[PDB]
Design a protein around this nucleic acid. Structure first.
Ligand SMILES: [Zn+2]
Ligand SMILES: [Zn+2]
Lengths: 184, 368, 368, 184
DNA sequence: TGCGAAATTCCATGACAAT
DNA sequence: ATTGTCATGGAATTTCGCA
DNA sequence: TGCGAAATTCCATGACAAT
DNA sequence: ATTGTCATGGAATTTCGCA
């Protein structure tokens, strides 16, 4: 079998609802399977329409052969199916209650949730503006398994924003508290 | 003046006055019989006034002025005197066109990597479409890969909004732009420093310097025009399609698309190239690095037969930007401080500010 | 299509398909192993659809379209098929630029006599001066002698008023003008027939054809600009001075002023030429007739390396005059009826009206 | 002495007052001495100002070395003198009550008055519009003494408007009457 | 080892413009 | 303190398929 | 029958434009 | 049914003044 490549498979999922930030509540997460590259789109709902609107932007830059998701209603709608079929994109679903991407993707998605949570707390409403820098961070994070960051794998060069000081995604004792207090 | 002309009348030789001619007096005027006919020789002290009267009839150049003068007068080295005056007619100097062409263009090296340099620019205004009138065009210098953003104004605020989305992907070392208001604002400068991005600006009124993006603007408009034939000019919904179409189009001279140059592999688009299906990604990136370094680069063309290249301390005039009707097309003369390159100079403009300026917007001041 | 591809698979030779390659079947598709790699050979009946899909991604030209197609497919004489489609893409045909230059310009003979031909034209609008906004410029073709009339509009009525004053002096055989509203009106046509004057018009949107007066407009504006430096643009009172100044200015290539060419003798103006003081008027007129016939006339320049000259029955496209934003710059193809001269043609425009048209406003339709 | 030339001497005089035509009452007459060429300018008065206004037009085309006139107030004013001096034009006056131009000029001026009178009568108010054609006629009228018309002498070519049918400047018995009736 | 035709490369031409 | 670019379709050149 | 300098001629460059 | 033009100032070329 032929070696894995960028655009072979995009993994998508929603994160949310989150505290409103400039009108938005959810984040559509797209991760390329081979490179671990991540794109994030703020939406107002986990709807087919929000998904199509967001993916229309991404697919103006590159088109995946396969999109993989869970059996979310947004992703299983016949509208979304029509959309994929128009672009020659094959849709692929994990079986219900049994989500399964890949190790790299699972770990990437873990990092995304943790990184968000960490930066959210203290300013849980300012996340709309942080999405660009969150993405740069995720995408210039060195992969222990491969020798490279997603940026390097996607573009074949070093980045002008190396993120050398890879911090804790872990919460400081302070943040733990101010996050426990937010949910009250 | 009176002395020289005195010695002449008796017949004692003066340098400049050919000895083989008969110089006589008549009507209180020194005269000479020259082949063309009898001419008055004015005293030296009168000549400037004469040259000026003749020149001022219609502010004529060298030969036309001389042809007037030679109708009445003869004296040694008339054109020297004519030229001395042309070089001092402020009105001629700032009104006349140049007849010397710019030196041959530079072909600046293609950026070595994607994200080394962006060229950016606004197209518009276009017919309104969903309230949008402009398109921010961002062209990666190395790859040619382009991003399009519809805006309602070519403003700093809209630029920043768009570029924040773009830089989600990657941050460029340099963004090059023209001297448009949206990019020269201090707010935009701050937005850049904040991110480690160096702003580079074209010399003023010289879109050749933004040629990468300007040329891409052509292609964008050309494809929009085609897709909109016999339909209303509803371009907003076509931007994404145009962006994708152009990023996946071959340049015949390179044999690659900008997408290929950016990623080294086609995505799921029509007619995707399959020649690296059996390479690993790493082998692909390796091949990509090779392809990037070996792209055709054009060379500087031959200079035209009458071009000028700028010299330190040379007198030169900058073109008035937006000259009013019936007003001069040129500024007063000014001096070349530094020659940045053979097409780009710093001048001191008699104010005197320092301006960095394209030679396409200069002429060498005539008559030294 | 299916027949040809059948014979191929067994190994029986088909013209067009090189015999030295292995043609096999796979995934229900006829394929071939070519040096670049394995390509699908589509049935003949499928190929047009393919060429069209590839071309339509970005409406690309020959090589760019081919480079897409060759990613997946191979078949005999692909570019022939590509070109067949380009020649039928209406959107490309009317949107793309030409890459063939016009043939070398004509240098029409100078009119033999003063008053043989006038070239006329309006300059403006200019900054208002005593309520005046335009200048009617009348240039005698033979002499270059020019008349200036200030007007409030470039109207037929103002033209007629001005020209009645001018023709008090003499009546021209022909007045040549551009296709401006003021000269194309039936009223102006009547004003002319009434007087024995033939109206001649430039081809539409081609001021080169009115070059005599256009070029004189340059000089007029240039001298006005100079005389108005550091003063308000009050040009009305300067028209008479400019007229006189320019009519008495030497053309260096001719060694005469337009005044001299018109009268054969200078009037009481500065630096008047005196070389025929001893001739009788008759001897002067005699010399004048000689001078008029022996003026320098320029010759047709060399054609550029890639020019085109028009042929009867050739397909050609006329440039859209004032194309809207995001609309094609070219009309639909049309046919060359008559070749008036190598720079001027009559076309039938598919409406089909007959238009007389400069080749500077045509391109040869591409791909036959 | 050097032979006579066009622009050597212009002879000028007023004709009028005439019946008003489009606001005008007088005709300033300019005749070049050598060629007999004639220019005509309608004015509202025989004033220095009207003279200067009219001659400013003519002198935009050609400048005479000498202007000759009678001792008309318009021509003898110090303003008119200033004007001539500015253009390097020498002024020359016939002695009072003793007008004297030249044979050619006298005859030319005779023709002008007669030609006007002839065309005026019947439409004594429409003369403003007739001035151009009057001038063409005068200027393409063959001189018995020289072999040529003023047009030919001025420009050294034939004209596109030869006036072959040289009519009577004499009045038909009809016109004599309708002109006698006008003055009533 | 050379031919005719197809494929590829060459390159003039023109159009993007402005602050 | 900065700097022209590149799609396009005929023509010229090279390569291909076959001896 | 030839030299150095002045005079003249040559000519690329650019700008007039539009209906 | 119509069609480029010509001022300009360096450079190239020619002519001049003198032997
Ligand atoms: Zn001047
Ligand atoms: Zn097309």
């Amino acid at each position: 079998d032929r070696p894995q490549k960028p655009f072979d498979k995009f993994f998508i999922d929603y994160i949310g609802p989150l505290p409103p930030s400039q009108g938005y509540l959810y984040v559509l997460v797209v991760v390329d399977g081979m490179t671990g590259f991540t794109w994030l789109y703020p939406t107002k709902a986990p709807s087919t329409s929000a998904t199509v609107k967001s993916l229309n932007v991404l697919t103006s830059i590159a088109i995946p052969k396969v999109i993989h998701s869970d059996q979310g209603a947004a992703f299983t709608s016949s509208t979304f199916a029509e959309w994929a079929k128009e672009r020659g994109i094959h849709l692929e679903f994990s079986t219900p209650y049994h989500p399964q991407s890949s190790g790299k993707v699972e770990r990437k998605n873990s990092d995304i949730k943790r990184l968000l949570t960490k930066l959210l707390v203290g300013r849980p409403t300012k996340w709309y503006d942080l999405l660009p820098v969150v993405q740069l961070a995720l995408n210039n994070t060195y992969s222990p398994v491969l020798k490279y960051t997603p940026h390097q794998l996607l573009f074949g060069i070093d980045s002008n924003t190396p993120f050398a000081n890879q911090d804790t995604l872990d919460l400081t004792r302070e943040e733990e508290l101010s996050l426990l207090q937010e949910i009250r | 003046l009176d002395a020289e002309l005195d010695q002449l009348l008796q017949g004692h030789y003066i340098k400049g006055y050919p000895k083989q001619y008969t110089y006589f007096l008549e009507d209180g005027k020194v005269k000479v019989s020259r082949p063309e006919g009898v001419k008055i020789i004015p005293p030296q002290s009168d000549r400037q006034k004469i040259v000026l009267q003749a020149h001022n009839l219609a502010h004529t150049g060298r030969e036309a002025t001389l042809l007037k003068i030679a109708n009445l007068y003869w004296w040694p080295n008339m054109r020297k005197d004519v030229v001395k005056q042309l070089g001092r007619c402020q009105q001629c100097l700032i009104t006349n066109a140049s007849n010397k062409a710019s030196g041959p263009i530079l072909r600046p090296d293609r950026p070595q990597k994607p994200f080394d340099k962006f060229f950016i620019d606004y197209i518009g205004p276009l017919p309104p479409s969903q309230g949008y009138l402009y398109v921010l065009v961002v062209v990666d210098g190395m790859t040619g890969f382009t991003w399009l953003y519809p805006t309602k104004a070519p403003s700093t605020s809209a630029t920043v909004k768009s570029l924040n989305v773009l830089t989600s992907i990657a941050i460029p070392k340099v963004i090059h732009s023209d001297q448009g208001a949206a990019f020269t604002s201090s707010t935009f400068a701050e937005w850049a420093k904040e991110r480690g991005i160096h702003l580079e600006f074209s010399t003023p009124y010289h879109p050749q310097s933004s040629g990468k993006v300007e040329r891409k603007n052509s292609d964008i408009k050309r494809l929009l025009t085609k897709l909109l034939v016999g339909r209303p000019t509803k371009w907003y919904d076509l931007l994404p399609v145009v962006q994708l179409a152009l990023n996946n189009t071959y340049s015949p001279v390179l044999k690659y698309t900008p997408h290929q140059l950016l990623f080294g592999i086609d995505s799921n688009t029509p007619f995707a190239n399959q020649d690296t299906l059996d390479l690993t990604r790493e082998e692909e990136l390796s091949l990509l690095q090779e392809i990037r370094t070996s792209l055709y680069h054009p060379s500087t063309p031959p200079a035209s037969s009458r071009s000028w290249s700028p010299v330190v301390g040379q007198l030169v005039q900058e073109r008035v930007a937006r000259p009013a009707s019936l007003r001069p097309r040129w500024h007063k003369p000014s001096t070349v401080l530094k020659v940045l390159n053979p097409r780009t100079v710093v001048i001191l403009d008699h104010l005197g500010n320092n301006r960095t300026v394209s030679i396409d917007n200069l002429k060498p001041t005539s008559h030294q």
